[PDB]
A paper describes a structure:
In the best characterized pathway, importin (IMP) α bridges cargoes bearing basic, classical nuclear localization signals (cNLSs) to IMPβ1, which mediates transport through the nuclear pore complex. IMPα recognizes three types of cNLSs via two binding sites: the major binding site accommodates monopartite cNLSs, the minor binding site recognizes atypical cNLSs, while bipartite cNLSs simultaneously interact with both major and minor sites. We combined bioinformatic, biochemical, functional, and structural approaches to study this phenomenon, using polyomaviruses (PyVs) large tumor antigens (LTAs) as a model.
The linkers between the two stretches of basic aas range from 11 aas in MWPyV to 32 aas in HPyV12. Strikingly, all other tested cNLS peptides bound as bipartite cNLSs (NLSbip), occupying both the minor and major binding sites of IMPα2ΔIBB with their upstream and downstream basic clusters, respectively. Similarly, in the case of MWPyV LTA, the fusion protein between GFP and NLSbip was significantly more nuclear than both GFP‐MWPyV LTA NLSm and GFP‐MWPyV LTA NLSct. In the case of MWPyV LTA‐GFP, substitution of key basic residues either in the upstream, downstream, or both monopartite cNLSs completely abolished nuclear targeting. Conversely, a duplication event involving an ancestral monopartite cNLS (red arrow) would have generated two closely located cNLSs, capable of binding IMPα either autonomously at the major binding site, or as a bipartite cNLS at the major and minor binding sites simultaneously.
Numbering used by the authors:
A (entry chain B): 135 to 140, 150 to 156
B (entry chain A): 72 to 496
Write the structure that this text describes.
Amino acid sequence: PKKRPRPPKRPRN
Amino acid sequence: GTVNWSVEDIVKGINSNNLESQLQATQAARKLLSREKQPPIDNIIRAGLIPKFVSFLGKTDCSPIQFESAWALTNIASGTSEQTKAVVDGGAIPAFISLLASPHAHISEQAVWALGNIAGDGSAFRDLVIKHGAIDPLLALLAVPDLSTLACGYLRNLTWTLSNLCRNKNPAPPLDAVEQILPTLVRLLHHNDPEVLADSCWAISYLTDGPNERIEMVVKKGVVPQLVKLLGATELPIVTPALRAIGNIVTGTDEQTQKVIDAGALAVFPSLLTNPKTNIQKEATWTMSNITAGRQDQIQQVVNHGLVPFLVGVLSKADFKTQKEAAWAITNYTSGGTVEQIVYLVHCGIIEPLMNLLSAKDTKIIQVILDAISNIFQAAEKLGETEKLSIMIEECGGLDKIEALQRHENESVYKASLNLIEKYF
């Protein structure tokens, strides 16, 4: 039993 | 008036010695870069205008040109990493951090927007923005008794820029910066604007995606109950980051996972595990798998909330990735659970979908399902009901699956299958 794993910019318009 | 200018005209106006002509040319550049259809960012950069815009950012005597230059540079920093780097190389970071203290709210808002675009490029520019000292004025902009007195767009842009200062890993944000920002993040997490709530949940999800120490910094602030409340929200833009953050938190210690459980998160998973959006279902099933990999009392809490039937359902019908997460959840349940809990799991109808999923073209889920099978058979041996089980697996067409897998490519696959058919069939 182990635990598993699985807008940066915006223009103004 | 300043619409549909050529880059040559903009350059001719900005290279004049007339502040008003420069202002009109800068506004033309802004309108040009504010077009949704292929804004000529690279042409503006090649023209060499970024340094002039950055210098205009410092003309406090002419606030309009400050605003227009901030807008233009914001839209240049909104593009590629090379274009954002062009903005940064002009010296725009300190100029924008200075503008953060502008008496005109629109200029400070545009500076927040620009700094958000710069920090969103990656961890390097993020940490550079932090080194230039943006966090102090950014948070000062939110030092008000009630956030509701601030303008909607202003607060939303500030929240989003703060989220980007919490975003990206390798390396994660500086510890001192996260500690500086967290209280304001909690305040925003208790705001009533859905956009602010979504961006704050995204920030918390970024901060929780990492080692258990970061998760602990977050959990110590007491945001888990609010994260669960938002998990029950109707707006999906809010549920998505909330679920991501809860899942990240349950990737850590058993005590942090128990903090998540105590806040009532499990009561929401009946819906999350049947959510019409595939991404929500996958995230919820992955969170459930990491919860079933915890202590036995936590597996029992999973059982009590009636979530085992929902795992059976997801395993029977769901997008294949969600089904693989469900298989992982089942294997963890059977590896860490008691005999009574595994018996309950079997009585809920897990065996038929577990068998049906053994015909997939993904070796890994095959290994996971076979490991869960072996665990259930071990728990049956402790009860002497191995034979009854074997008959169940045969009745649903499972023995055929294991026998056909005996002739499989991967080693451990056929090894485990042969072990099963030799020890139980």
